Design a protein around this motif. Structure first.
Motif, mmCIF file in Angstrom:
data_model
loop_
_atom_site.group_PDB
_atom_site.id
_atom_site.type_symbol
_atom_site.label_atom_id
_atom_site.label_comp_id
_atom_site.label_asym_id
_atom_site.label_seq_id
_atom_site.Cartn_x
_atom_site.Cartn_y
_atom_site.Cartn_z
ATOM 1 N N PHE B 36 0.869 -1.125 -0.061
ATOM 2 C CA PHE B 36 -0.006 -0.159 0.057
ATOM 3 C C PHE B 36 0.908 1.255 0.029
ATOM 4 O O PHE B 36 0.380 2.036 -0.652
ATOM 5 N N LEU B 37 1.999 1.134 0.742
ATOM 6 C CA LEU B 37 2.859 2.376 0.796
ATOM 7 C C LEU B 37 3.539 2.744 -0.519
ATOM 8 O O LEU B 37 3.912 3.917 -0.729
ATOM 9 N N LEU B 38 3.689 1.683 -1.312
ATOM 10 C CA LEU B 38 4.247 2.017 -2.729
ATOM 11 C C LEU B 38 3.331 3.010 -3.323
ATOM 12 O O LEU B 38 3.717 4.305 -3.994
ATOM 13 N N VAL B 39 2.036 2.868 -3.514
ATOM 14 C CA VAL B 39 0.995 3.683 -3.950
ATOM 15 C C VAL B 39 0.695 4.985 -3.277
ATOM 16 O O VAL B 39 0.886 6.250 -3.898
ATOM 17 N N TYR B 40 0.750 4.978 -2.086
ATOM 18 C CA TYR B 40 0.805 6.051 -1.194
ATOM 19 C C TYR B 40 1.783 6.901 -1.377
ATOM 20 O O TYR B 40 1.778 8.237 -1.336
ATOM 21 N N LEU B 41 3.342 6.491 -1.715
ATOM 22 C CA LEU B 41 4.527 7.247 -1.776
ATOM 23 C C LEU B 41 4.291 7.925 -3.313
ATOM 24 O O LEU B 41 4.909 8.988 -3.608
ATOM 25 N N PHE B 43 1.570 8.752 -4.505
ATOM 26 C CA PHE B 43 0.820 10.095 -4.394
ATOM 27 C C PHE B 43 1.372 11.136 -3.618
ATOM 28 O O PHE B 43 1.266 12.291 -4.128
ATOM 29 N N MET B 44 2.143 10.972 -2.630
ATOM 30 C CA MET B 44 2.863 11.747 -1.955
ATOM 31 C C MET B 44 3.874 12.402 -2.596
ATOM 32 O O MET B 44 3.906 13.813 -2.589
ATOM 33 N N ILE B 45 4.517 11.808 -3.541
ATOM 34 C CA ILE B 45 5.423 12.322 -4.135
ATOM 35 C C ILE B 45 5.039 13.534 -5.057
ATOM 36 O O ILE B 45 5.461 14.512 -5.261
ATOM 37 N N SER B 60 16.358 25.241 -0.316
ATOM 38 C CA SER B 60 15.961 23.871 0.276
ATOM 39 C C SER B 60 15.328 24.187 1.697
ATOM 40 O O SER B 60 14.673 23.164 1.974
ATOM 41 N N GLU B 61 15.823 25.150 2.423
ATOM 42 C CA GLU B 61 15.213 25.366 3.497
ATOM 43 C C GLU B 61 13.808 25.627 3.519
ATOM 44 O O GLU B 61 12.854 24.950 4.199
ATOM 45 N N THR B 62 13.234 26.161 2.421
ATOM 46 C CA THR B 62 11.938 26.572 2.380
ATOM 47 C C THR B 62 11.011 25.350 1.785
ATOM 48 O O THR B 62 10.068 25.036 2.310
ATOM 49 N N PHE B 63 11.712 24.425 0.959
ATOM 50 C CA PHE B 63 11.055 23.306 0.591
ATOM 51 C C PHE B 63 10.900 22.432 1.740
ATOM 52 O O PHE B 63 10.020 21.482 2.031
ATOM 53 N N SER B 64 12.008 22.347 2.732
ATOM 54 C CA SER B 64 11.994 21.369 3.833
ATOM 55 C C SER B 64 10.867 22.001 4.887
ATOM 56 O O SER B 64 10.065 21.045 5.293
ATOM 57 N N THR B 65 10.884 22.939 5.035
ATOM 58 C CA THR B 65 9.633 23.557 5.983
ATOM 59 C C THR B 65 8.505 23.356 5.294
ATOM 60 O O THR B 65 7.258 23.054 6.167
ATOM 61 N N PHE B 66 8.079 23.581 4.067
ATOM 62 C CA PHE B 66 6.723 23.014 3.406
ATOM 63 C C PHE B 66 6.477 21.755 3.595
ATOM 64 O O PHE B 66 5.530 21.598 3.800
ATOM 65 N N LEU B 67 7.475 20.933 3.391
ATOM 66 C CA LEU B 67 7.450 19.573 3.775
ATOM 67 C C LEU B 67 7.016 19.346 5.066
ATOM 68 O O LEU B 67 6.008 18.454 5.447
ATOM 69 N N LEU B 68 7.508 19.909 5.939
ATOM 70 C CA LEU B 68 7.186 19.536 7.431
ATOM 71 C C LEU B 68 5.714 20.261 7.637
ATOM 72 O O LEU B 68 5.083 19.416 8.119
ATOM 73 N N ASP B 69 5.279 21.201 6.980
ATOM 74 C CA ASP B 69 3.966 21.571 7.483
ATOM 75 C C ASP B 69 2.968 20.729 6.561
ATOM 76 O O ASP B 69 1.826 20.498 7.412
ATOM 77 N N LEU B 70 3.149 20.249 5.430
ATOM 78 C CA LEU B 70 2.527 19.262 4.665
ATOM 79 C C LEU B 70 2.299 18.107 5.418
ATOM 80 O O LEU B 70 1.044 17.460 5.488
ATOM 81 N N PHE B 71 3.534 17.463 6.025
ATOM 82 C CA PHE B 71 3.296 16.323 6.884
ATOM 83 C C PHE B 71 2.350 16.502 8.185
ATOM 84 O O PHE B 71 1.597 15.651 8.545
ATOM 85 N N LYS B 72 2.590 17.725 8.679
ATOM 86 C CA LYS B 72 1.850 18.054 10.056
ATOM 87 C C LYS B 72 0.338 17.968 9.629
ATOM 88 O O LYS B 72 -0.516 17.738 10.273
HETATM 89 C C1 LIG Z 1 3.848 9.005 5.464
HETATM 90 C C2 LIG Z 1 5.197 8.456 5.484
HETATM 91 C C3 LIG Z 1 5.136 7.065 5.787
HETATM 92 C C4 LIG Z 1 6.285 8.878 4.537
HETATM 93 C C5 LIG Z 1 6.918 10.141 4.899
HETATM 94 C C6 LIG Z 1 8.371 9.819 5.455
HETATM 95 C C7 LIG Z 1 8.328 10.763 6.686
HETATM 96 C C8 LIG Z 1 9.686 10.015 7.391
HETATM 97 C C9 LIG Z 1 8.863 12.248 6.327
HETATM 98 C C10 LIG Z 1 7.754 12.878 5.716
HETATM 99 C C11 LIG Z 1 8.118 14.319 5.911
HETATM 100 C C12 LIG Z 1 9.503 14.496 6.308
HETATM 101 C C13 LIG Z 1 10.127 15.771 7.063
HETATM 102 C C14 LIG Z 1 10.132 16.721 6.179
HETATM 103 C C15 LIG Z 1 11.137 18.162 6.587
HETATM 104 C C16 LIG Z 1 11.714 18.053 7.485
HETATM 105 C C17 LIG Z 1 12.765 19.271 8.224
HETATM 106 C C18 LIG Z 1 14.437 18.643 8.116
HETATM 107 O O1 LIG Z 1 15.034 19.471 9.046
HETATM 108 C C19 LIG Z 1 14.588 20.805 9.073
HETATM 109 O O2 LIG Z 1 13.938 21.268 10.174
HETATM 110 C C20 LIG Z 1 14.474 21.867 7.865
HETATM 111 C C21 LIG Z 1 15.449 23.008 8.628
HETATM 112 C C22 LIG Z 1 16.747 23.539 7.806
HETATM 113 O O3 LIG Z 1 17.391 22.795 7.304
HETATM 114 O O4 LIG Z 1 17.249 24.646 7.590
HETATM 115 C C23 LIG Z 1 14.598 17.267 8.813
HETATM 116 C C24 LIG Z 1 13.496 15.990 8.430
HETATM 117 C C25 LIG Z 1 11.985 16.389 8.588
HETATM 118 C C26 LIG Z 1 11.581 16.478 9.821
HETATM 119 C C27 LIG Z 1 11.629 15.365 7.188
HETATM 120 C C28 LIG Z 1 11.910 14.094 8.113
HETATM 121 C C29 LIG Z 1 10.901 12.814 7.474
HETATM 122 C C30 LIG Z 1 9.631 13.102 7.251
HETATM 123 C C31 LIG Z 1 8.759 13.194 8.601
#
Ligand SMILES: CC(C)CCC[C@@H](C)[C@H]1CC[C@H]2[C@@H]3CC=C4C[C@@H](OC(=O)CCC(=O)O)CC[C@]4(C)[C@H]3CC[C@]12C
Ligand SMILES: CC(C)C[C@H](NC(=O)c1cc2ccccc2s1)C(=O)N1CCN(C(=O)[C@H](CO)NS(=O)(=O)c2ccc(Cl)cc2Cl)CC1
Ligand SMILES: CC(C)CCC[C@@H](C)[C@H]1CC[C@H]2[C@@H]3CC=C4C[C@@H](OC(=O)CCC(=O)O)CC[C@]4(C)[C@H]3CC[C@]12C
Lengths: 475, 123, 145
Positions: B36-41, B43-45, B60-72
């Motif tokens: 299931f996680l293959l298909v979910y991934l 979609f996620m990607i 890169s920092e903006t992308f990481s912050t957006f990814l964090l927000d989207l996961f939350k």
């Molecule tokens: C639904 C699941 C099974 C698939 C996703 C895998 C997770 C383990 C991914 C999803 C979002 C990811 C996060 C997206 C962004 C960040 C921030 C990154 O560091 C930062 O805070 C960026 C700030 C900076 O570097 O300046 C560390 C990993 C983390 C928590 C990532 C770690 C792994 C996470 C939680």
């Protein structure tokens, strides 16, 4: 007379001193005696026996009287033969018998379709014939008709016959696996390139942009490759549509959804290009949607895998049928409650309605805050209505849809092996049909065994295919 | 330490009352959840790349912050504030709605179908 | 001949005035007649009956002709015995029969694996043998495999 199970009448009418009714006679529809016999054929126990008996008797008589011409060769106006028509109509009873027809008579054993190769102890190897069962584009094949056509009563049962399974297995081993992974790798690489191109998109400036820097060399290539890939997809999808003699709506819309989705992906990707030349401002809006659709429609390649073959089929099935049927009722509830709540509130209007709808959707997810009640009058009834909304939808419907969803997945679990075989056959045939004709002929399967000689002694030299099995009670 | 604590189900395998649980959780985890996680991934990607590309900052920092927000958000908490800065907010919300609908409504609890079927075989 | 269910051919070939085919003969793989008979054994209703019948007949003949050596003792190159190979291959039909083999003949009842201990009314106590079924590290055991 033949369809009414009257062998004596048929025998007399065929050979009479006054007049004779030639068996190779076609009506307005083009159907001959065998065609009609197949048409009235039924899967019932009693009907099949007499149908097969009459079919064999009539075929033997026709061959005996006319040795030069074979009766089954004649085709109707639709172009089908008795074997092909039986396959298309879903009549397994006569189909299986026709596939494994064996004639003991020495005089007219040439028209048999199943031969004996050799026996070593319990092992018995027999040599089936597939002259018309598999065709490399020369003519329509039984396999393609059996697979692609929709609304067949016993497609799954007819697929499980002695030569069909072995032929599919051999075809998959010979080239299917080699090209399937190449397909997956190429498509995933193209999608990665498209994603990288989409990310590194300069918002500043009016499209098109000048390309002067080193990074421009790499950036332009991604767009060019994606556009050419979309055009190639469109061309492939029109070629395929014309290849199957323009299948109608039933072939595209109801099933094989991925055959339609890539068409949509074909459109948007090129549509954006036009905008990118003139409608510079808003090409991203549709380009991103095209990218999302392309990423989401990669389950066609996962269909083949045995471990995850079912998942794609069943998600496509449940999505359009169960979720939409439930969503009709859910939308009734949504419309009613949203209209009621919008009407009830007192501001002291389109923007206010849109903002309220946004807030209500955010609540519907399960987040947000309930602050609207403060401004409106009659807050108590408002809360009562919100509670009824939440109760009904979330408690009952949200997870009662899961009941029939799990029942659907249960049907798929009960028929998992059967559906996976069909999907695997579909994908391998799909992959095969895109090859050029000459290459397909170069990949012909089977042997050229000269099992027997014609009436005049000339060798038949027909393509065949050998299989083997084990029996222990043949003593 | 976490792995050591988590891998104590070997000793629970023996108990008759809870013997099945460990075997079936190990079985379902690697086979059903990953399939299931293959298909979910997929979609996620797709959706994450689309949303990252769409937004206009003015990486890169903006992308990481957006990814964090989207996961939350994906968990079911957080706030939807990203739409304010980006252009074409309406399509952004439409895409977010499709993401939420598809994943949460269909997949999140349709995995449960074959998961329950697996537990049914084990039963 | 044994694998093809031809008892007469086996009987003639075993005892012939011209030449005799010793039953304790191993091929390149090391498999002897019992090994091959187990290899072709199947869980089908008809196959199991004749497989067991031929196995018992051949074992009894080998024991009768050579009382000192037991045929099942011989091992293949892999080190397995007919019982162990049947267990490893998943052929229950011959395995269960081998486990509970009982010989009524007085002359060659020693090679039996199931004995009768005593009967008190409806209660019947029987004494199975597990010489090779369970091993304390001395040799491979059927249970571990
Ligand atoms: C639904 C699941 C099974 C698939 C996703 C895998 C997770 C383990 C991914 C999803 C979002 C990811 C996060 C997206 C962004 C960040 C921030 C990154 O560091 C930062 O805070 C960026 C700030 C900076 O570097 O300046 C560390 C990993 C983390 C928590 C990532 C770690 C792994 C996470 C939680
Ligand atoms: C070339 C052969 C060795 C194999 C052949 N693959 C290709 O030609 C290309 C793959 C890729 C990948 C990235 C970029 C460019 C190409 S060109 C192949 O094996 N197939 C294509 C024809 N097929 C189809 O056209 C289905 C069935 O009719 N329709 S579809 O759903 O719309 C589709 C599916 C996948 C691909 Cl990809 C293209 C399309 Cl319209 C089937 C399967
Ligand atoms: C449960 C599902 C399957 C059915 C509902 C369909 C959704 C796609 C609907 C539900 C609420 C809708 C939203 C309600 C309000 C708005 C604001 C609207 O633009 C505004 O922000 C209004 C401000 C202004 O114009 O001044 C754009 C669409 C959006 C996000 C709508 C887009 C589509 C949404 C998410």
């Amino acid at each position: 007379a033949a369809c009414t199970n009257q062998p004596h009448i048929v025998n007399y009418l065929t050979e009479n001193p006054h007049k004779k009714a030639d068996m190779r006679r076609q009506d307005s529809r083009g159907n001959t005696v065998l065609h009609a016999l197949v048409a009235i054929a039924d899967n019932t126990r009693e009907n099949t026996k007499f149908v097969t008996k009459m079919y064999d008797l009539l075929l033997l008589k026709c061959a005996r009287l006319f040795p030069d011409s074979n009766l089954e060769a004649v085709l109707n106006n639709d172009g089908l033969s008795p074997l092909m028509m039986a396959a298309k109509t879903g009549k397994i009873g006569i189909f299986q018998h026709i596939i494994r027809r064996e004639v003991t008579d020495e005089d007219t054993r040439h028209l048999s379709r199943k031969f004996k190769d050799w026996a070593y102890g319990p092992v018995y190897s027999s040599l089936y014939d597939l002259s018309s069962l598999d065709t490399c584009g020369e003519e329509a094949s039984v396999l393609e008709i059996l697979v692609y056509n929709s609304k067949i009563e016993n497609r799954h049962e007819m697929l499980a016959v002695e030569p069909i399974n072995e032929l599919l297995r051999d075809k998959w081993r010979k080239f299917g696996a080699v090209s399937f992974y190449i397909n997956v790798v190429s498509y995933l690489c193209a999608m990665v390139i498209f994603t990288l191109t989409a990310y590194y998109q300069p918002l500043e400036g009016t499209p098109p942009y000048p390309y002067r820097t080193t990074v421009d060399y790499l950036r332009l290539a991604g767009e060019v490759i994606t556009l050419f890939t979309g055009v190639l997809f469109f061309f492939t999808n029109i070629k395929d549509l014309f290849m199957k003699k323009c299948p109608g709506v039933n072939s595209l819309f109801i099933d094989g959804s991925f055959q339609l989705l890539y068409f949509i992906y074909s459109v948007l990707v090129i549509v954006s290009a036009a905008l990118y030349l003139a409608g510079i401002e808003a090409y991203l809006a549709v380009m991103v949607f095209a990218l999302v659709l392309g990423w989401m429609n990669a389950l066609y390649f996962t269909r083949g895998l045995k471990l995850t073959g079912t998942y794609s089929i069943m998600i496509q099935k449940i999505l359009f049928k169960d979720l939409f049927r439930f969503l009709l009722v859910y939308l009734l509830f949504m419309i009613g409650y949203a209209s009621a709540l919008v009407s009830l509130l007192n501001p002291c209007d389109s923007e206010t309605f849109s903002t309220f709808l946004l807030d209500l959707f955010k609540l519907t997810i399960g987040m947000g805050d309930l602050e609207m009640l403060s401004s409106t009058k009659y807050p108590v009834v408002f809360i009562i209505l919100l509670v009824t909304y939440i109760i009904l939808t979330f408690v009952l419907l949200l997870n009662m849809l899961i009941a029939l969803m799990g029942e659907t997945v249960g049907q798929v679990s009960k028929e998992s092996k059967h559906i996976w075989k069909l999907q695997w056959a579909t994908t391998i045939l799909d992959i095969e049909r895109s090859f050029p004709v000459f290459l397909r002929k170069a990949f012909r399967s089977g042997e050229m065994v000269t099992v027997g000689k014609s009436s005049d002694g000339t060798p038949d030299r027909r393509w065949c295919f050998r299989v083997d099995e084990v029996n222990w009670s043949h003593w």
